[PDB]
Design a protein around this ligand. Structure first.
Ligand SMILES: O=c1[nH]c(=O)n([C@@H]2O[C@H](COP(=O)(O)O)[C@@H](O)[C@H]2O)cc1F
Ligand SMILES: O=c1[nH]c(=O)n([C@@H]2O[C@H](COP(=O)(O)O)[C@@H](O)[C@H]2O)cc1F
Lengths: 257, 257
């Protein structure tokens, strides 16, 4: 029934970016995405270098980097290639198609030039995907749709979630998976990435809620954990990353049997 | 029953930014927001200067400006002050509170430093507002919640829209209104701004749908029209702006009786 990440990498309908990701997940025994929520390029890069071997993906918010330049992203790419991880800009495109295509390709950030993956909210309807696709398909990029959110009061539930899944499944040449709290698609070609993860119970003061890797990967069937503060705020970010990696990887293995 | 924009500017619960906006709308006889969807700062600024007298607001997407700098925004502010319009960055914050506060204050764009208004999607739950508020309240800024979208397939309908209205009404110290296609709140202290506006019927190839100023202001009860391409793509952008201004203003007057 369920397939390993390595086997999923080979599925007929797999997207190339998903395949690359799944292959390196399997090779490196990591289903951890670091949420590199820092404001300094040097810290970003130092985290990417040190934690690169432990992660399958590094998620950015370029718009919080005080000293963003495209050269920082070049350096990040070098690290991504060296250590084998994808770069995911958590931009949450969420506009009409005509707007998002420009936000993806252009401006100061030139996101499409460096991000293997981006994501989108599905609230605008499928034009958000169509617009992004116009830039991302030629650049061989992938997209994640936000089907569920980790925060208190999230409206990404029920029929909204179902709409996200449909929209993904209908745009499989570009959409490679989801941000979700659980498996939402039954199709194994899609990736599930789950934020709101910490080893300890809790949440923040602004609506973030946490669940553990075992819950999210093991019980809820997701693929990848996205971890920010649980790693970033720790003293030893490498050890923290390793804890999260080992947690998510074992949860995956055990669910696989 | 219904009040003029000038009277709404005085309502007990009005937010200061809303009041400033409503006052200049009344003074200038404009309920037009220009969507300055351009990639060149010089064009942005030349539009802001020429069209400033015709608009109540200039909506930006800073992330499509190829040559963004903070000095461009300084120059835009000078124009906004000269001509009396607000600056609205259509950022659509749509993340957990902890993230959006950083995206609003920081990074290269420093949005909170120059934008009178921003907007947010309500999908994350009210933490998106709470996070933004932590930056925006001290800076005396306002926020718009996206209650409805103009695009085909929008999921901002029904209970989602109602949730947006509730979230606004419960965060009235910062939330000053909505992006919506119609009046969604019955409380006159809230602004309704409607995109997807053109004089002619139609829509774009990526899900945008258009309705006229008379429909949106006159029949659907919104306050302000947001117009991009209907102005920007016209040869004479000043005349186009004037057409849209006159259309939206008369629709408002006639609905007022
Ligand atoms: O539903 C979501 N929840 C999230 O937390 N995120 C992001 O994951 C990260 C979570 O970080 P934390 O520090 O582990 O809470 C942070 O960048 C968020 O913007 C994205 C989402 F789409
Ligand atoms: O629902 C929405 N529809 C929109 O069109 N917009 C923005 O208004 C603008 C509409 O531009 P147009 O050229 O008039 O279609 C454009 O910047 C969009 O990103 C925002 C929304 F929230």
């Amino acid at each position: 029934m369920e397939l390993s990440f390595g086997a999923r990498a080979e599925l007929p309908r797999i997207h190339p970016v998903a395949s690359k990701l799944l292959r390196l997940m399997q090779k490196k025994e990591t289903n951890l995405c670091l949420s590199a929520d820092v404001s300094l390029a040097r810290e970003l890069l130092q985290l990417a270098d040190a934690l690169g071997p432990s992660i399958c993906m590094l998620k950015t918010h370029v718009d919080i980097l005080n000293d963003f330049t495209l050269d920082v992203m070049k350096e990040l790419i070098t690290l991504a290639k060296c250590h084998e991880f994808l770069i995911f800009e958590n931009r949450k495109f969420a506009d009409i198609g005509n707007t998002v295509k420009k936000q993806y390709e252009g401006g100061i950030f030139k996101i499409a030039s460096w991000a293997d993956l981006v994501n989108a909210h599905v609230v605008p309807g499928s034009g958000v995907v169509k617009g992004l696709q116009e830039v991302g398909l030629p650049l061989h990029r992938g997209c994640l749709l936000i089907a569920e959110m980790s925060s208190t009061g999230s409206l990404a539930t029920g029929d909204y979630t179902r709409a996200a899944v449909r929209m993904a499944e209908e745009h499989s040449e570009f959409v490679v998976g989801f941000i979700s709290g659980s498996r939402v698609s039954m199709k194994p070609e899609f990736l599930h990435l789950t934020p709101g993860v910490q080893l300890e119970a809790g949440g923040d003061n602004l609506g973030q809620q946490y669940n553990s890797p075992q819950e999210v990967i093991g019980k809820r069937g997701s693929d990848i954990i996205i971890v920010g503060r649980g790693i970033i705020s720790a003293a030893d970010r490498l050890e923290a990353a390793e804890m999260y990696r080992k947690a998510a990887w074992e949860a995956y293995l055990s669910r696989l049997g």
